[PDB]
C-alpha cells in the first residue's frame with residue numbers, strides 16, 4: 537500500500553507486505569519516535585527525498601508500544617534509524633539524523 | 648576486553664567531568680587506566696550503552712569509552 | 722503538567738550550567754522535553770527519548786541513558802539536540818523556552 541512520491545507510514549502489520557512487493561524498488565524505512573529531536577528535524581528532508589526519488593519507496597514506522605515487536609525485530613538503538621531493504625531483506629542502514637549518509641545509502645541502493 | 652585490563656586512551660576523547668578539570672575541556676588521550684566494567688547487560692538483561700567500556704584512572708576518576716578509543720597494554 | 726514543568730526547568734537550568742544552548746528551532750527542544758517527561762512519568766527516570774530500548778527497566782537501573790546521559794555528562798554530546806554546544810550549526814542563542822511554546826508544539830503533534 538505504498539505510494540510513490542510521498543512517505544507512507546506503516547505499522548507492525550502493514551510493513552512486511554509492502555516490502556514483499558517492492559520488486560526491484562529499494563525500500564527505505566524511517567524508524568522514529570514522536571518525541572525525538574533529530575527525528576523531527578529530519579522530517580522535512582525525508583519528505584523531499586520521497587518526492588525526488590520516485591524509483592524508491594519511502595516509509596516510516598513509529599517505534600511505540602504498538603509497533604514494539606516490529607521495532608525489536610528490525611533492530612533500532614539510535615532514533616531515528618533508516619533501514620534500506622531490497623529483496624525482502626535489509627541491505628543498508630543509517631543511524632541518526634545523517635542526511636548526507638542517508639543520501640549516499642539511497643544512491644548506493646539505487647545503483 | 649576484560650575487567651582489570653590495563654588500557655591507554657588512543658583516540659581523542661574530550662571530557663568535562665574530571666575533578667581537576669571541572670567543567671573544562673580535557674582530552675584523556677594518552678592516559679592509562681584499568682577497565683572497571685564493560686556494559687553489556689544488567690543481571691542478564693541486555694542494555695544499550697554506546698560507550699560501554701568503563702575505565703578507572705587515578706583518584707577513582709572514571710570515564711566511558713567505545714572499544715576503538717582504547718588499546719590494551721600488555 | 723507538574724512533571725513537564727519540572728523537566729522544562731531542569732533543561733533550562735542544565736543548559737545554563739553547562740554553557741550549552743537550545744536548538745534554533747525550539748520545536749526540537751520542545752519534543753525532547755516532552756519525551757523526557759513521559760519517560761520520567763512511566764519509568765521513574767528520564768530515559769533519553771532518542772534511543773530505543775529492548776529493556777527499559779534494565780536501562781533505568783543501568784542509568785547510562787538517564788538524562789543527562791553519560792555522553793552528555795562526560796563529553797557534552799547530546800544526540801537529542803536538547804543541549805547543543807556553541808559550535809553546533811543548529812545551536813541557537815537561547816537557554817530558555819516558554820511553557821507556551823512547549824504547549825503549542827505538543828498540540829501540533831495531535
Ligand code: SF4
Nearest residue numbers: 769788790793799800
Ligand atoms: S542525548 Fe542525553 S542529555 Fe540529551 S536529551 Fe538524550 S538523555 Fe538528555
